[PDB]
Write a protein that binds this DNA or RNA. Structure first.
Ligand SMILES: [Mg+2]
Ligand SMILES: [Mg+2]
Lengths: 112, 187, 129, 51, 175, 52
RNA sequence: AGAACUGGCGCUGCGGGAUGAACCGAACGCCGGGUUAAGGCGCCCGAUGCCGACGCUCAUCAGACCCCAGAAAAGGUGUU
RNA sequence: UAGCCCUGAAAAUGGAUGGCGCUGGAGCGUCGGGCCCAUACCCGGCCGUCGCCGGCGUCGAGAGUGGACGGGAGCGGCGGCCCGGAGCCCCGCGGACGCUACGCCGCGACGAGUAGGAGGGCCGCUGCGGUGAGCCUUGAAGCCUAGGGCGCGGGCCCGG
């Protein structure tokens, strides 16, 4: 909790991170996930052969959440264009380092 | 910065032989073509053994090859070894087996051919069986070297069996203390 | 306008200032040839700001632009006629230098041969009468 | 890599329903616009009919 | 808490999880003044854990909603009760303000405890707040504005410097 | 115990054709339930004053 | 002076703390655009040249930003 | 009772909120909105390294991730007097580059460093075996240079 910032993402936060900062690992590299042939070939075993079927198993946490999430490369996000508040104390305490439960969606729209 | 690794991350196998033998380089150009084009794992094992050292390619005696091909099923396959075939004096008769090696020795290749056998190289192995189909590939005893019985824990360690480096085997050469219960201790 | 190559790109170079040795301004026993300084307390090996930059592999020039002359050719120094005819099939990408050794009589014949084969020589007006 | 959410038909190479999701919402907020522009006029037209 | 900007009132109710020993716990109510609904449901567990044996892992909140005032356009008198910590000890304190809204008077208190007593926003607890009427006020800074036909001028007015030309030939009259 | 009550429950659904999913999960987030405050009101509590 | 756990310095530049081994941010191939971290925005000195909000304070020794580079008991019908 | 200010409160060259300086603040407390910048973060270019591969098909005829023939029966599409059958290149004789295989090409991630350890050097010096039908009194070596450049660098080539 001193080092992360987290909360519960809504439906176009989970959409804006896939369509803009979406990247996969087939064997071991980060490819830009341009085609539905890049999801179906590596992860069509699980019935989730396209892009919005990838996003359905990651918003509603489905039966195949583990393999769809581990397919996605971790989102290499930009630094926030508003600026952070104090970075070293909790979001309750005045800073921003912890659980903020839906304000995280206000932060993703500046990070992304 | 990203992580806190110790940087292994440079794989320390061999990608080509250190040998400058131009005949052995032609086998590599034969088989690293086959390894990337035939979808067989025979041609990946043969290709990585052509890379290997003279230590990691041990010889194979002619009596292990006929011991490891009198098994059930092996009667009409080929003996493959990336390495040399010396003969055993200890064996009395030789069957009519079909072999394939880099460098069979002179006495061993006289005894295979008297018994009706057939020696191959890796060139005419590739034209007969490109996939490696119908082959029994073998290896010699790579821990058969005298070097490996000096390797272990340490000779003074209890329950070691590790053969110390002595300049002459005999009485008075590393036998007194640390080797018997009278003179001090036994390890 | 004289003999033009194939396609010439724009030659960027990452630095055009010729890495000089440290403390070489201060001493005339120290030539400007770069040696990297392996001392313990020096501030150039330790890479402080505002001081002598030290070379590494990041300054390396583009692979399709390395060793290009500013005319867009790439030199290859010759000595006589017969190793100037080895360059007939590269006359639009590679150019010739007549070496510093070749005399002014032989230099006349290997510049008038490269006119026929349409090979550019970078020093055609050297050692003339 | 081009940007879906920024250009069309890179969405539609990845999500074909995103076009008919988009003209079904450009139509209805063009008719909700007409429903509110005519409401503001025809209310204050009868108000302009009085005075 | 930081108490950033204007504060905001919250009605936060909550109960502890149903045990084999007590089905249907009584589900208490509080009145939280907080900058947003994440600090409000945090400070709910700060005060409830001081009074009951409830804590956030063995409880849940069932509603956290912003309760706002029922007369934003009516000038009211707010006397509030505080429990700040000082450098030596801790003190109880009654303290009046005067504002259009409930939530802005307690904003005006944190701005005033920090000003007059150097009391940071974490070391201060709000006991209760209500609108009081005139003739029940004690504080004469609040009491002096209880004046039908109140009137005063604005002496010595000063504002808008460098927004006008930074160099002029004109000495600015202060009315 | 849960190699005993797993294998007797594995064949218990093999004879009945279901999808019991005998692999354990850790404590999930709580179900969307519906509390009742029947009749009465939520009791107001306030922080008490300080005394020694 | 001597130990425990973790990080760092030594081996390590960079932004900030005026100054600096170790503090605070952040670790570094060569560059362009963007955005921030810690810290700041009268002028040295980039940026408040906002018609910033509420109060407190007068010092003939005022105060002024982690480490951190100066103070205590006791007292004041000085003011809140 | 506790906020700020005051007394308590004295040291040796002249001096330090960093300085100038500031008192409707440039002080202290509580906060707001803008704004300023690091080698950090994101997007792009390039270099190198690591990893994972591609290409012997230069196959303008290879056409291939299931193909044969050839027999006994069938529908569509083709040229009819409701019966019917391979045409193998051609009016153009043509068709870029490439694969030092120890070379070329692709994709992705990474890059601090003392002591220390490895790899590459088409870095440099002196001599030997081979080799350039090398090079020169129409000027070698050496040395000089506000001359022209090349390489990340070691260094090098050229001009006078
Ligand atoms: Mg040092
Ligand atoms: Mg810290």
């Amino acid at each position: 909790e001193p080092y992360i910032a987290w909360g519960y993402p809504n439906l176009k936060s989970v959409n804006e991170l896939i369509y803009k900062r979406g990247y996969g690992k087939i064997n071991k590299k980060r490819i830009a996930l341009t085609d539905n042939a890049l999801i179906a070939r590596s992860l069509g075993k699980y019935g989730i052969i396209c892009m919005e079927d990838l996003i359905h198993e990651i918003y509603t946490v489905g039966k195949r959440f583990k393999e769809a999430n581990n397919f996605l490369w971790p989102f290499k996000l930009s630094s926030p264009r508003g600026g952070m508040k104090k970075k070293t104390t909790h979001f309750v305490e005045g800073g921003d380092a912890g659980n903020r439960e839906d304000q995280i969606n206000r932060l993703i729209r500046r990070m992304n | 910065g990203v992580d806190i690794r110790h940087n292994k991350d440079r794989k320390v196998r061999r990608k080509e032989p250190k040998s400058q033998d131009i005949y052995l380089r032609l086998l590599v150009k034969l088989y690293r073509f086959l390894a990337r084009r035939t979808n067989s794992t025979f041609n990946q094992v043969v290709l990585k053994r052509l890379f290997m050292s003279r230590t990691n390619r041990p010889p194979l005696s002619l009596s292990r090859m006929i011991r490891k091909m009198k098994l059930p099923g092996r009667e009409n396959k080929t003996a493959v070894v990336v390495g040399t075939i010396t003969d055993d004096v200890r064996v009395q008769e030789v069957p009519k087996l079909k072999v394939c090696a880099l460098r069979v020795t002179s006495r061993a290749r006289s005894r295979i051919l008297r018994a009706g056998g057939k020696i191959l190289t890796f060139d005419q192995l590739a034209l007969d069986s490109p996939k490696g189909c119908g082959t029994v590939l073998l290896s010699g005893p790579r821990k058969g070297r005298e070097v490996y019985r000096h390797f272990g824990k340490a000779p003074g360690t209890p329950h070691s069996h590790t053969k110390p480096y002595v300049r002459s085997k005999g009485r008075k050469f590393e036998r007194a203390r640390g080797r018997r219960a009278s003179r001090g201790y036994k390890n | 306008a004289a003999l033009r190559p194939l396609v010439k790109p724009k030659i960027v170079k990452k630095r055009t200032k010729k890495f000089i040795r440290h403390q070489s301004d201060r001493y005339v026993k120290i030539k400007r040839n770069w040696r990297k300084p392996r001392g313990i307390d020096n501030r150039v090996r330790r890479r402080f700001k505002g001081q002598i930059l030290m070379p590494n592999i990041g300054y390396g020039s583009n692979k399709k632009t390395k060793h290009m002359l500013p005319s867009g050719f790439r030199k290859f120094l010759v000595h006589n006629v017969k190793e100037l005819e080895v360059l007939l099939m590269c006359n639009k990408s590679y150019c010739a230098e007549i070496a510093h050794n070749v005399s002014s009589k032989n230099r006349k014949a290997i510049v008038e041969r490269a006119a026929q084969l349409a090979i550019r020589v970078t020093n055609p007006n050297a050692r003339l009468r | 890599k081009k940007n879906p959410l920024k250009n069309l038909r890179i969405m539609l190479k990845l999500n074909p329903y995103a076009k008919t999701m988009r003209r079904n919402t450009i139509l209805r907020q063009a008719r909700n616009h007409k429903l509110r522009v005519d409401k503001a006029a025809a209310a204050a037209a009868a108000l302009q009919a009085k005075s | 808490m930081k108490a950033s900007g204007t504060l905001r009132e919250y009605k936060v109710v909550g109960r502890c999880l149903p045990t084999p020993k007590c089905h249907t716990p009584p589900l208490y109510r509080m009145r939280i003044f907080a900058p947003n609904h994440v600090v409000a449901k945090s400070r709910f567990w700060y005060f409830v854990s001081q009074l009951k044996k409830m804590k956030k892992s063995s409880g849940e909140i069932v509603y956290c909603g912003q309760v706002f005032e029922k007369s934003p356009l009516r000038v009211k008198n707010f006397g509030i009760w505080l429990r700040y910590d000082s450098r030596s000890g801790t003190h109880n304190m009654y303290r009046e303000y005067r504002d259009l809204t409930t939530a802005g008077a307690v904003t005006q208190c944190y701005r005033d405890m920090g000003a007059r007593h150097r009391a940071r926003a974490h070391s201060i607890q709000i006991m209760k707040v209500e609108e009081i009427a005139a003739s029940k006020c004690r504080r004469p800074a609040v009491k002096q504005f209880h004046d039908s036909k109140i009137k005063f001028p604005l002496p010595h007015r000063v504002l808008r410097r460098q927004h006008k030309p930074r160099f002029t030939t004109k000495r600015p009259n202060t009315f | 115990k849960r190699v005993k009550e797993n294998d007797q429950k594995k064949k218990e659904a093999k004879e009945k054709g279901t999808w019991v999913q005998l692999k354990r999960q850790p404590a999930p987030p709580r179900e969307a339930h519906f509390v009742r405050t029947n009749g009465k009101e939520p009791e107001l509590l306030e922080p008490i004053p300080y005394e020694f």
